Design a protein around this ligand. Structure first.
Ligand SMILES: O=S([O-])[O-]
Lengths: 220, 219, 222, 220
């Protein structure tokens, strides 16, 4: 009833502004929604080289690519073909704050992603502006309903040079476009996002993501 | 030098709160040295706004604050070239807004390019339900962090029914010209009010009064 | 690096003294567990301050990461911290302003872990779910373990299930410190947790608690 | 007739534990409730010399001593002779968290303060454990009612050696012991606290505080 196919293309356009620097990044990728895997090639079309760590944008670069077991309601796959949208806040431990949105629509075998990303108050000597990030660590999103809306909260951490970490708290709210899509119960979503390759200045990046929903111990 | 006793304000805000895009124009006047400014606002697009207009109002210029002679006035020292600010508002129910302003001057007019984005406001909360009455008067705590003037504020919106809605504000302020000397720690008292509005806030008259001081016992 | 003297089956002796919103209480615990299976359980008895005027659940995460199953590719700080032991301190920040801090000093004698627990909580609203006892249980969660300023630290996004099927969020931060020199710090990893009140009397003066915890490295290898 | 006299004495005993270090501090002071001023001599009875910055304890060492104007209800002066108590959390930007409680009663011309202070999760290399604090900057408490209880929130900042600042957010709830003390409307309370003198290791400290409530601008 979704018309979500086992192999899907992804078409993404993101425009943003972090600390006054405007950028536009295009993505073209492919994914396996039922396998919870996606990858994409990204190109900074405007505003490169980015004066800040590319990693902070990468979670903005679609929970339709999360493997859901049968015992958990899969709000995202049930949201199609009309699609859904999300809004997120990323609160970093040094006061940097970003918000992002994405409206996901599907035409055929392609998801289209309209992504906006704005960040403010990153310290000049912090690891984001000084590009000291190495990767996001694997994380687990906590998904619950609040005020009739599916919401995901995650304790996230960017690995830095020296193997220090930089903490970020994210909150995302997810909203099906079509009315009456059934909200899931509380669950967890394991995430692992990775930049597989990049040019020296991150004007081109290959990004990979793997996400699996589960109900926690003892069952997972 | 740059800043005259009476001064005009031209503002354009583009925003998106909870996915609703809007554009608001502002034409105003103030007295920088008395720390008072007033502005007429017209929602040019996205009207009527589906959310509390009050959340936008602190984004609608610290050059309009009365600084006393004993405290360095970074804002007036930033002109003619001007300065910019970036702000996050973290509301107690998870709603978060970020805003930027780039302020420039030509002649007797300040030009404000304002952007405002808000996400994650709950549908039955006072913001989406428009249950706000006003920002309470507040005090900004101004300090330097990582070489940047920063202002933090414990803010509270009065709601219908006499409850309050808490927000924490952090603003960073940056002069465009290199070498503007940063102030030491100080406070800025703020009072913002909507003086009038039409029923759906497509037109609003806004007024703000701000005074910088060094706290007790000398304030 | 050395023999821990941690046996596959251990006893637990716990004494907690605390104050939440001005109400003092003392709670004693006797339990047993399997450190290598990451499972433990204990019978708790409120020794005074009973019956508690707040939700018992907020105390439960304070009632030992030595009971967590670690795979051998993740360094297990807690088991190596024995025989001498370790201590932790923790803050719980609840979404409505309630804030708790808690400390445990853990030692081992023979086949028994001894836990000296303190718990202090302030600013919970009178009509909030903690003070009105509207909580059902903690949801399963995942702690993110990492080294922060040279100290092993775990941060958790937690949520209490309430009556009416709402959730009440809490953020926890715990610092863990071995008592002896030479304990190797682990790299970033995750710890799945699930805690549950198995049974209780009407006023929670008596409670049976169980916990299961498993360490892992996240996707793709978990 | 009034329980609040123009010249009052203060008797205080604090017991605390910060980062596992236990301590007991006794305080003997005087103040002028109507002028919003008080001072106290403190002596560390147990656990001295303290291994952390004494300044973090100082706001725990009574809003009875705040000058309130006629047009703002003075909850604190109206709470006596029976008294009131407060509970507070101090959330420092580097993860240190302190909670404190004070139960204040009165006998004759003396206030009795039973204070408890606990802190956890201060980093070894941070300004509290390294004793790099110089003072609390002057601040303004925002006072409002929430769920029937008078609550005060403050954006606070410790000046550090080197002219940096260390941020702390505090929230305090205040509750009269008598039923029927009328809650105030929203208002502000300016505070300044200062250590007037101390011995090298802070085993003896003289502390002073001045507080004035007001309605904000325009008025004052
Ligand atoms: O993991 S549960 O069964 O406590």
């Amino acid at each position: 009833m979704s018309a979500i196919k086992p192999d899907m293309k992804i078409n993404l356009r993101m425009e943003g502004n972090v600390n006054g620097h405007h950028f536009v990044i295009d993505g073209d990728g492919t994914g396996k929604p039922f396998e919870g895997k996606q990858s994409m090639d990204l190109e900074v079309k405007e505003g490169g080289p980015l004066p800040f760590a590319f990693d902070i944008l990468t979670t903005a670069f679609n929970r339709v690519f999360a493997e859901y077991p049968d015992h958990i309601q899969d709000y995202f796959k049930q949201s199609f073909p009309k699609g859904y949208s999300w809004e997120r806040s990323l609160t970093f431990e040094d006061g940097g704050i970003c918000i992002a949105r994405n409206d996901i629509t599907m035409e055929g075998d392609t998801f289209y992603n309209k992504v906006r990303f704005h960040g403010v108050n990153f310290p000049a000597n912090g690891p984001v502006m000084q590009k000291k990030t190495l990767k996001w660590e694997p994380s687990t999103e906590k998904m619950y309903v609040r005020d009739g809306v599916l919401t995901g909260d995650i304790t996230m951490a960017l690995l830095l040079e020296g193997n220090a970490h930089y903490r970020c708290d994210s909150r995302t709210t997810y909203k099906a476009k079509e009315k009456g899509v059934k909200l899931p119960g509380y669950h967890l979503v394991d995430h692992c996002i990775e930049i597989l390759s990049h040019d020296k200045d991150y004007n081109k990046v290959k990004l990979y993501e793997h996400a699996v929903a589960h109900s926690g111990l003892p069952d997972n």
